[PDB]
Amino acid sequence: GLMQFTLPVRLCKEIELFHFDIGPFENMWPGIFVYMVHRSCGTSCFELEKLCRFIMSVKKNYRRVPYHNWKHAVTVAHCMYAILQNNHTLFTDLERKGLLIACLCHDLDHRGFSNSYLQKFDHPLAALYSTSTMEQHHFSQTVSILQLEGHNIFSTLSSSEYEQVLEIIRKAIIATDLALYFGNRKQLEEMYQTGSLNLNNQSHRDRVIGLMMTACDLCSVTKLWPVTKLTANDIYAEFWAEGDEMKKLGIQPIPMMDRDKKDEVPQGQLGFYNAVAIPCYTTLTQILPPTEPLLKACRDNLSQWEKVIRGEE
Ligand SMILES: COc1c(C)nc(CSc2nc3cc4c(cc3[nH]2)OCO4)c(C)c1C
Numbered sequence: 414g415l416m417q418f419t420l421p422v423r424l425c426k427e428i429e430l431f432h433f434d435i436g437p438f439e440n441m442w443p444g445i446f447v448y449m450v451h452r453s454c455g456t457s458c459f460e461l462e463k464l465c466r467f468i469m470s471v472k473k474n475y476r477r478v479p480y481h482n483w484k485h486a487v488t489v490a491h492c493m494y495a496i497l498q499n500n501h502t503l504f505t506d507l508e509r510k511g512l513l514i515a516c517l518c519h520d521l522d523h524r525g526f527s528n529s530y531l532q533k534f535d536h537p538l539a540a541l542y543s544t545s546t547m548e549q550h551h552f553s554q555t556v557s558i559l560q561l562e563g564h565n566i567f568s569t570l571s572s573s574e575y576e577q578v579l580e581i582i583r584k585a586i587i588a589t590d591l592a593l594y595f596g597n598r599k600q601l602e603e604m605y606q607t608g609s610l611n612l613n614n615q616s617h618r619d620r621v622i623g624l625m626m627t628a629c630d631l632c633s634v635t636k637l638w639p640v641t642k643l644t645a646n647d648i649y650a651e652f653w654a655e656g657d658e659m660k661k662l663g664i665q666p667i668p669m670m671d672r673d674k675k676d677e678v679p680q681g682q683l684g685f686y687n688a689v690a691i692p693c694y695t696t697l698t699q700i701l702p703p704t705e706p707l708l709k710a711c712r713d714n715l716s717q718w719e720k721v722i723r724g725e726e
């Protein structure tokens with residue numbers, strides 16, 4: 414109980430910043446996460462015995478893929494931590510508990526292939542879940558891990574609070590389906606602009622949590638240029654593998670996934686920053702002012718991609 418996690422001075426300082434990189438030492442990631450749970454939630458939120466067993470079962474059910482891996486899980490959770498810490502008073506005890514656990518679990522058992530590839534392959538998961546295929550799978554896997562003996566980190570919630578937090582984690586994980594993001598942000602954009610946005614309305618909170626999940630999920634574009642640039646290699650390595658597998662099914666993939674069209678990556682990044690990233694962190698900054706540093710970092714990285722195209726790197 415009186416057992417805190419402590420990080421070295423540089424990590425203790427930099428972990429509080431939105432652009433923190435969790436580093437290349439896999440064995441430190443679990444303690445980094447427990448550290449974030451303790452500061453954000455409390456040392457009491459979770460039985461440390463059961464949290465540590467949950468954290469390790471989650472790690473084991475992430476696969477060895479270039480990008481949708483255990484590092485990504487902890488990275489997305491760190492971005493959620495940074496939002497929760499800069500927005501102390503806006504979130505319930507149940508929301509802070511749920512959202513860190515949601516972020517850690519959001520891509521469980523990812524195989525490194527989009528919903529689109531599962532559908533055309535006619536993968537069994539596409540038969541069980543017609544929309545948000547992988548995201549319904551990630552939540553399924555989260556529930557299964559919570560039901561292993563000794564792994565129910567929520568066991569000291571009342572029946573109602575337990576049902577509330579699983580509902581938070583389910584909407585949070587489904588919202589990481591980027592297909593659902595455009596709609597969610599347009600609605601949040603209208604609601605903010607006509608002044609009808611109301612954080613006491615549960616359906617409004619759900620939308621705002623959804624956008625936080627998209628913001629944390631995309632946080633690779635909010636890092637310092639060299640992390641952003643080196644993460645892009647891992648992102649495209651999965652995409653080009655999927656593109657290869659599309660060709661094996663006799664389907665020309667979209668250029669984003671065609672390793673023969675690497676030359677168009679910088680121009681594709683521009684579209685993506687302009688179409689998804691900048692709009693995402695703009696509406697987030699409007700609803701939650703202290704998350705501005707994510708919008709600033711995103712715009713710096715847009716400028717770095719403009720320079721790549723202009724040949725200056
Ligand atoms: C941060 O997350 C992402 C990052 C960094 N990048 C991307 C890729 S965005 C994107 N759209 C593209 C279109 C293209 C292309 C590369 C492209 N990259 O080559 C020719 O036509 C995604 C989809 C996510 C989700």
Ligand SMILES: [Mg+2]
Pocket residue numbers: 519520547589590
């Ligand atoms: Mg996902």
Ligand SMILES: [Zn+2]
Pocket residue numbers: 485489519520589630
């Ligand atoms: Zn993700």
